[PDB]
């Protein structure tokens, strides 16, 4: 009971470090830069064929196949350039809530209410998509799951906890602890030795994958982190909340470096990506719309509308050519 | 144009039409959201169904004449509410298990539940079919203690149909959206028919409803 | 996953027999099925064609209106009735699944074949070559020329490169002129550009030699031009 006072002091000696570096503001750097322009994108794919609220979505890393998760019980790999239907896979549990898709293409994922991440092997002899593993031992719902090399995938789980597991032999190799609320969301370092994991408890902690320790916490949010994204650089991350702003932070600082908030918008966010080179913002809304923010500025570049409900997945594509939105009813939209 | 693209198209368009059959199959099933406080008799209705491996929704599937029903148990979940009730927007009816024999401010709980999961904002126009388990324990009890342990405002005799009357009332009135959803409340009985007959009964009601909504009527 | 042939013997001219290929370990109702024909000492000659779900039905010209091609799907069996037998329908018939979706690999797996004995096209692919002597320790180049561009407005050229071994049925060895086929040694390549096209062997041993087709993808007549030998 004595241990609270040595923990306020650490606190404190933290804040007082972060307010040492904080000697300008990225704002009043970066407003000499010249604006990006208005932003127009136009709908050139749509995506038809999910009977109900689609959850989750993810691209391949060829930026041509997607896969597409509906709580109709369905995973559906689309070929995006000719809207076709590759895969059709049926899932014992219709509440599904994320899914994944392999580096390598050979397998996909999923989870949701059932506390079991199943991962799907696409590439068979027999002519069929069949379940390769059931991981189980999480306690709670995954919010999300990320594949690391083809064997090993990091997920997220509602009962406080992340977990990378070993698909082969199918136990959990180790066990990230030290979230208070549920996780909602994980991004994958681009060289995948460390991740973000966003929780309800208004907090993001950067996770080593090897020594399975938390290295940076993050707060500044003020309510539920439902998405988040690592900067290309892969430097700087962003998150996004039910508070209706986006936040971006940096790792070196270990502090805040922006906010992205509009007066008008109140809903809450559910998907957050970046562009190719960073320099743009995806963000997508409660209030049935995807807003593109200048990542350097903090001025609303653009509005992509056009999706009748939530928006509650988006990605982009490596190579950076589109953007696919997904909502509640039932459509993806490729954007270009 | 296309020179093994269109074998492609036609895998694509057989796997269009498996989708859409599968959804007009799974388009004339019932789906119940079952919801209690605590395991409060939710096991003894399960048990009329007639037909940790898993621990985070359980399905369970009957028939009643020829009518399928689906009810989603989500009792082991014990993470926020808020993060996944949406995913039940569409669920045709929620039954809510409460019992009676309540012992430390159990009802309390179970009110602060029913207020939560009523007045939700995704459960608008949603039924909930309200069952009262544990009638001859709550006679038994009655007879015993009195119904001012729980209700300190209470003014009436310890009369089983009195205290029982003054429950399902003091249930009812929790429900703000008096105009848009229905309230249907039933005293389990050990008779496994009844509790069955009571449910298609509700869901025929909200079928009814719903397609006077669909239909321009309302 | 293994496709066996049943239904051959010898016939007399203007007769009628059945051919039937029972397929097991995979998903017969996903495969699109093709009969292939291979005369004695002769190259091979596409002959029918049918979709999966029974949906389009293709004919080789030579033997269309009395050949007829079909599918049981729940017994998993393929059936040719032939009709009107001439003495040029003596051959060995094959039976071969293809599978058509975004980055498959049509033409994988093939029968053994059951052999039919008769008592007494616009794209052509040409395999200049015939024979080729070989020491297990060189690398090897077989070329296939076409009448036409077989790449096609979508990035793709569509030929395929198959191996007959002495005594066995033809595997696939490269689809689209570039992708090496499941479970095939690395040291076999593909190249080309167009309408000439390219073969590589780094390094050969005992079971490279055999007799190597060039078949084209982009027409369905689907021509396979007569084979290079490798022996010794």
């Known amino acids: 009971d004595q241990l609270r006072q040595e923990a306020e002091q650490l606190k404190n000696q933290i804040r007082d470090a972060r307010k040492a570096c904080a000697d300008a503001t990225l704002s009043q750097i970066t407003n000499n830069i010249d604006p990006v322009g208005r932003i127009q994108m136009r709908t050139r794919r749509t995506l038809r064929g999910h009977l109900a609220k689609i959850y989750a979505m993810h691209w391949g890393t060829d930026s041509r196949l997607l896969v597409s998760a509906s709580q109709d019980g369905k995973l559906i790999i689309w070929d995006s350039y000719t809207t076709n239907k590759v895969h059709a896979i049926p899932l014992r549990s219709s509440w599904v809530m994320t899914c994944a898709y392999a580096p390598s293409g050979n397998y996909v994922a999923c989870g949701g209410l059932d506390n079991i991440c199943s991962i799907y092997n696409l590439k068979t002899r027999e002519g069929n998509v069949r379940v390769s593993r059931e991981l189980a031992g999480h306690t709670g719902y995954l919010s999300c799951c990320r594949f690391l090399d083809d064997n090993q995938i990091v997920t997220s789980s509602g009962d406080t906890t992340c977990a990378l597991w070993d698909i082969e032999t199918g136990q959990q190799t180790t066990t990230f602890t030290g979230h208070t609320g549920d996780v909602m969301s994980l991004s994958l370092a681009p060289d995948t030795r460390l991740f973000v994991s966003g929780a309800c408890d208004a907090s993001a902690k950067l996770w080593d994958v090897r020594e399975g320790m938390c290295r940076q916490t993050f707060t500044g949010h003020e309510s539920d982190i439902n998405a988040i994204c690592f900067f290309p650089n892969g430097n700087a991350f962003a998150t996004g909340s039910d508070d209706a702003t986006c936040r971006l932070f940096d790792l070196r600082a270990d502090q805040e470096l922006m906010t992205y908030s509009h007066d008008n918008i109140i809903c809450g966010i559910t998907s957050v990506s970046f562009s190719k080179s960073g320099r743009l913002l995806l963000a997508g809304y409660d209030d049935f719309n995807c807003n593109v923010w200048d990542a350097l500025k903090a001025d609303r570049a653009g509005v992509l509308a056009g999706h009748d409900n939530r928006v509650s997945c988006l990605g982009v594509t490596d190579d950076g050519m589109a953007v696919a939105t997904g909502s509640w009813d039932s459509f993806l939209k490729i954007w270009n | 144009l296309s020179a093994e693209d269109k074998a492609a198209v036609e895998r694509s368009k057989m796997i269009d039409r498996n989708l859409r059959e599968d959804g007009e199959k799974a388009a004339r099933e019932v789906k119940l959201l079952l919801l209690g406080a605590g395991e409060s008799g939710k096991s003894t209705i399960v048990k009329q169904m007639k037909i940790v491996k898993t621990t985070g929704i359980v399905e369970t599937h009957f028939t009643f004449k020829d009518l399928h029903f689906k009810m989603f148990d989500v009792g082991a979940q014990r993470s926020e509410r808020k993060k996944w009730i949406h995913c039940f927007e569409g669920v045709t009816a929620i039954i809510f298990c409460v019992a009676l024999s309540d012992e430390m401010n159990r009802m309390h709980e179970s009110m602060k539940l029913f207020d939560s999961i009523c007045n939700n904002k995704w459960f608008t126009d949603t039924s909930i079919i309200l069952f009262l388990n544990k009638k001859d324990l709550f006679e038994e009890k009655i007879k015993k203690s009195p119904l001012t342990i729980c209700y300190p405002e209470y003014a009436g005799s310890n009369t089983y149909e009195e205290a029982a009357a003054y429950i399902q009332c003091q249930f009812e009135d929790l429900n703000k959206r008096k105009d848009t959803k229905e309230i249907y409340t039933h005293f389990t009985c050990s008779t496994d028919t009844k509790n069955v007959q009571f449910v298609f009964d509700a869901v025929t009601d909200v079928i009814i409803k719903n397609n006077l909504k669909d239909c321009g009527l309302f | 996953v293994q496709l066996v042939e049943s239904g051959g013997g010898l016939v007399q001219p203007g007769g009628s027999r059945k051919l039937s290929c029972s397929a097991s370990?995979?998903?017969?109702?996903?495969?699109?099925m093709h009969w292939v024909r291979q005369a004695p000492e002769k190259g091979l000659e596409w002959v029918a064609y049918?979709?999966?779900?029974?949906?389009?039905?293709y004919y080789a010209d030579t033997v269309k209106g009395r050949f007829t091609i079909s599918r049981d799907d729940p017994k998993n069996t393929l059936f040719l009735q032939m009709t009107s037998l001439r003495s040029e329908d003596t051959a060995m018939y094959y039976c071969?699944?293809?599978?058509?979706?975004?980055?498959?690999?049509?033409?994988?797996?093939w029968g053994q074949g059951t052999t039919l004995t008769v008592s007494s096209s616009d794209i052509v692919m040409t395999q200049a070559t015939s024979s080729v002597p070989v020491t297990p320790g060189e690398s090897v180049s077989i070329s296939c020329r076409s009448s036409?561009?077989?790449?096609?407005?979508?990035?793709?050229?569509?030929l395929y490169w198959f191996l007959q071994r002495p005594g066995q049925s033809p595997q696939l060895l490269i689809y689209?002129?570039?992708n090496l086929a499941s479970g095939v040694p690395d040291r076999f390549s593909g190249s080309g550009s167009g309408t000439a096209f390219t073969l590589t062997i780094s390094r050969l041993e005992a079971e490279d030699v055999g007799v190597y087709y060039c078949?084209?993808?982009?027409?369905?007549?689907?021509?396979f031009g007569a084979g290079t030998k490798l022996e010794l």
């Open positions: 071969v699944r293809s599978i058509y979706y975004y980055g498959s690999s049509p033409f994988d797996f």
């Open positions: 370990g995979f998903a017969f109702s996903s495969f699109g």
């Open positions: 049918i979709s999966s779900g029974s949906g389009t039905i």
């Open positions: 036409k561009s077989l790449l096609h407005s979508n990035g793709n050229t569509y």
């Open positions: 689209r002129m570039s």
């Open positions: 078949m084209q993808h982009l027409e369905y007549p689907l021509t």
